[PDB]
Amino acid sequence: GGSLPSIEQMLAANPGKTPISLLQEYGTRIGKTPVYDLLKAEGQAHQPNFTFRVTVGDTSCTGQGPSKKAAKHKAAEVALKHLKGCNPVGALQELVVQKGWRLPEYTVTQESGPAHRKEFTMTCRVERFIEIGSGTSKKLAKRNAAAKMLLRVHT
RNA sequence: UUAAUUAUCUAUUCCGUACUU
RNA sequence: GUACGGAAUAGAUAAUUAAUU
């Protein structure tokens, strides 16, 4: 167990999780709760812009990012401080089609065990070339495999 | 006609963390 | 019962790129 909790102690004990999930764990000790408000949601489906605000007791702060996840993450990170007071897949497809080859293909060969810390290994396939990559999602794994493949097919 | 990328929402499944009964 | 977080599947919306017609 433990005693006399503090916001300085979480940074040494579990800084690996989001400040969103971590800031509410601190809220329970002080009786406060981090309320989340979306300040902004606009832009094209290629480079949009998001804003979050978090409120903990008599204080509130904001954060921003290219996604809903990145904007909420930065805002919780700012509250904690005051409480302490190109596409490789598309580039490869454009080459593979220009070289006269058949369209690229992707297949998973491996996966991690824990679902909360999932990982993937994916193979890229071209008319003569084959390469492998990995990532925290099947979409990220093919992106990594495409990045290594761009070095193989290109000369 | 085909392939690839990105953001948001809803539903389902799995997993992790905190609080509470 | 509540809040936050990741992965997979399905549906809806939107923008972008390449090849072909």
From Swiss-Prot:
It is found in: Cytoplasm; Cytoplasm, Perinuclear region; Nucleus. It comes from the Eukaryota. Residues 10-85, 86-155 are annotated as: Sufficient for interaction with PRKRA. Required for formation of the RNA induced silencing complex (RISC). Component of the RISC loading complex (RLC), also known as the micro-RNA (miRNA) loading complex (miRLC), which is composed of DICER1, AGO2 and TARBP2. Within the RLC/miRLC, DICER1 and TARBP2 are required to process precursor miRNAs (pre-miRNAs) to mature miRNAs and then load them onto AGO2. AGO2 bound to the mature miRNA constitutes the minimal RISC and may subsequently dissociate from DICER1 and TARBP2. May also play a role in the production of short interfering RNAs (siRNAs) from double-stranded RNA (dsRNA) by DICER1. (Microbial infection) Binds to the HIV-1 TAR RNA which is located in the long terminal repeat (LTR) of HIV-1, and stimulates translation of TAR-containing RNAs. This is achieved in part at least by binding to and inhibiting EIF2AK2/PKR, thereby reducing phosphorylation and inhibition of EIF2S1/eIF-2-alpha. May also promote translation of TAR-containing RNAs independently of EIF2AK2/PKR. Mediates recruitment of FTSJ3 methyltransferase to HIV-1 RNA, leading to 2'-O-methylation of the viral genome, allowing HIV-1 to escape the innate immune system. Belongs to the TARBP2 family. Self-associates. Component of the RISC loading complex (RLC), or micro-RNA (miRNA) loading complex (miRLC), which is composed of DICER1, AGO2 and TARBP2. Note that the trimeric RLC/miRLC is also referred to as RISC. Interacts with EIF2AK2/PKR and inhibits its protein kinase activity. Interacts with DHX9 and PRKRA. Interacts with DICER1, AGO2, MOV10, EIF6 and RPL7A (60S ribosome subunit); they form a large RNA-induced silencing complex (RISC). Interacts with IRF7; this interaction prevents IRF7 phosphorylation and activation. (Microbial infection) Interacts with FTSJ3; forms a complex with FTSJ3 and HIV-1 TAR RNA. This is RISC-loading complex subunit TARBP2. It comes from Homo sapiens. The chain holds residues 16 to 227 of 366 of the full protein.
